[PDB]
Amino acid sequence: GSSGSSGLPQVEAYSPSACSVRGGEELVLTGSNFLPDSKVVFIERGPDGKLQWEEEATVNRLQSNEVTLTLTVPEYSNKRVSRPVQVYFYVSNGRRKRSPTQSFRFLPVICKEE
């Protein structure tokens, strides 16, 4: 065994690229080195300088796998927004090992609805 990897969670791709502030959708995270205990939490930056957001999202283990992470996009603090918000998320694996933050954004539905 050589110095290759450190059992760290990787994120190849993620879809849908974006979603509505409402969420309540099925988000699939493509990658590898995933664990059945890993968690997916979202974060939000404030006009103060520090970010603080605790929102848990349902995780479907049945769909998720060693190289798959399926969860239910959580609800954004502010839903009645006329403008989209840029947010990020990561995966918690272990104590030191973690995943990189992905560039996400919530689009308003008040105007653009299906």
Swiss-Prot record:
A motif (Nuclear localization signal) lies at residues 95-97. There is a cross-link at residue 112 (Glycyl lysine isopeptide (Lys-Gly) (interchain with G-Cter in SUMO2)). Widely expressed, with high levels in placenta, lung, kidney, testis and ovary. Weakly expressed in spleen and thymus. In the hippocampus, expressed in the granular layer of the dentate gyrus, in the pyramidal neurons of CA3 region, and in the hippocampal fissure. Expressed in the heart (at protein level). Rel similarity domain (RSD) or Rel homology domain (RHD) allows DNA-binding and cooperative interactions with AP-1 factors. Member of the multicomponent NFATC transcription complex that consists of at least two components, a pre-existing cytoplasmic component NFATC2 and an inducible nuclear component NFATC1. Other NFAT proteins, such as NFATC3, or members of the activating protein-1 (AP-1) family and MAF can also bind the complex. NFAT proteins can bind DNA as monomers or dimers. Component of a promoter-binding complex composed of STAT3, NFATC3 and NFATC4; complex formation is enhanced by calcineurin. Interacts with CREBBP; this interaction potentiates transcription activation. Ca(2+)-regulated transcription factor that is involved in several processes, including the development and function of the immune, cardiovascular, musculoskeletal, and nervous systems. Involved in T-cell activation, stimulating the transcription of cytokine genes, including that of IL2 and IL4. Along with NFATC3, involved in embryonic heart development. Following JAK/STAT signaling activation and as part of a complex with NFATC3 and STAT3, binds to the alpha-beta E4 promoter region of CRYAB and activates transcription in cardiomyocytes. This is Nuclear factor of activated T-cells, cytoplasmic 4. The lineage of its organism: Eukaryota, Metazoa, Chordata, Craniata, Vertebrata.
